[model samples]
Structures are given as structure tokens and as C-alpha cells.
Target: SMEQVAMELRLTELTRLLRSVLDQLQDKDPARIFAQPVSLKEVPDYLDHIKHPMDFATMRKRLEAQGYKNLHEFEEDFDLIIDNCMKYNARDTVFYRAAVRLRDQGGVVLRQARREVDSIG
Candidate 1:
């Protein structure tokens, strides 16, 4: 629990520092910057927290194998894949956006994930 606490504290501090810098650099969209993961290092780990459907799982693995180092690097590709998948699969609309929001929250929390899906639906 101590480790978890320490990690949360560190992330809070890191986010505060990043916010300070982003405020000066992109005052108009500081929230947008904050919404993104602060570093590529956590992206892979964060990905596991997202709920995935089979096809997207395979696609994600393919992208990962192709060396996606960050969420930002993979974002456009993700949107493309989701768009294409949505064209053929109606259920994918629910799954896709839910997973995206889950990841955007840093790591997924069941309550938050449920709330997001509920709100979207």
C-alpha cells in the first residue's frame, strides 16, 4: 500500500509540474495536455487496464509489435482502426470509445469506467 501511495504522490507531483509548464506553453489547452499520459513509459502498462474486444486486441498487438512507444504515437492509428471497425461492427462503437476513455483516465478504475460508459450510452 505504501508503494501505491508513493506512486500516486509521485504522479500527482509530476502532473503538477507538467501543468505548470503546459500553462505557460499552451494556456489555451492545458486541460488537453493534462488529459494525456505524461510519458511513454506508462503507456504500455496503462494499455492493459483497458477492456478490449478480440479484433482490436489483435490489432493492438500488431501495432505494439510494430513498435508503438507511446499513446500519442498510436493515437491516429487507433482512431483509424476504430473507424474502420465501426463501419462493419455496430457493437464496436460501444467497446471502442469505452476503451479509449478508460485509457485516457491514466489507468482504468471500474467505477470510473462504468460511469463513462453509462454517461456515453
Candidate 2:
């Protein structure tokens, strides 16, 4: 019914799925860390450990800028967000566990994006 080539359809569908991923993570930011960039004052050693920090807010802005050409691009940044958390927080720490949980959830949504984008063809 609609007229769109596969590339356009993948872009549209995958982009929407990416938004859902970001929104959901931002919603359940239990420790309040995932929502925005880490503050040096709050966690002064953050930069010392996390050489390249990423966050939901930054990802949101990048998405709106159309910085992602595909789902993989979006996944890379989102994974960085999760990895940074797990790295900064210790294994048994609350935020570390939260990152683990979110990573699991991310896997589900990412596969959903993969399936949906392929179906758009």
C-alpha cells in the first residue's frame, strides 16, 4: 500500500525501533545514571576510567540528528552506554546489575529491530 524502497523502509522502521529502545532505557534509569552524561563532580574518577562515556541523552540527540545510518550504528552507541555502566560500577554493585539487566533487555529489542527491518523489504 505504501511506496518505499527497502533502504528507506529499513531506515524508517529501524529508526523508530531505535527510538523505542532509547525511550525505554531512559524510562527505567533506576540509578539515574543512564539518563544523562556522567558528571565529573559527581563521579570525578569517571573520566579516568571511562575514556569515552556515552549516555541516553547524547544518544537521543544523535538520533534526532540522523547520525545513525542503520540499526548497527545505533546499537554500537547504546552498547557503549551499557558497557560504560558495567565498567564504572563493580560487579555486585546496584548500577552494575542494572546495566546487566538493561543489556539483556537491549538484546531483545535489538533482535526485534533486526526482524522488523528485514521484514520491511
Clashes of each: 0, 0
Clashing pairs in 1: none
lDDT of each: 0.39, 0.80
Which structure among the candidates has the greatest lDDT?
2
Q: In model 2, which regions exceed 4 Å deviation?
A: 1-14, 28-31
**Predicted candidate 1 versus true structure: per-residue lDDT over 3-48, tens digit per residue:** 9887666555544433333233223322342223323374454334
Clashes of 1: 0
Mind giving the per-residue lDDT tens digits that candidate 2 earns over 11-63?
Answer: 76666777886777666666676888988998888888998899888999998
Q: 17, model 2: CA deviation in Å?
A: 3.5
The weakest ten consecutive residues by lDDT in model 2 span 1-10
TM-score of 2: 0.80
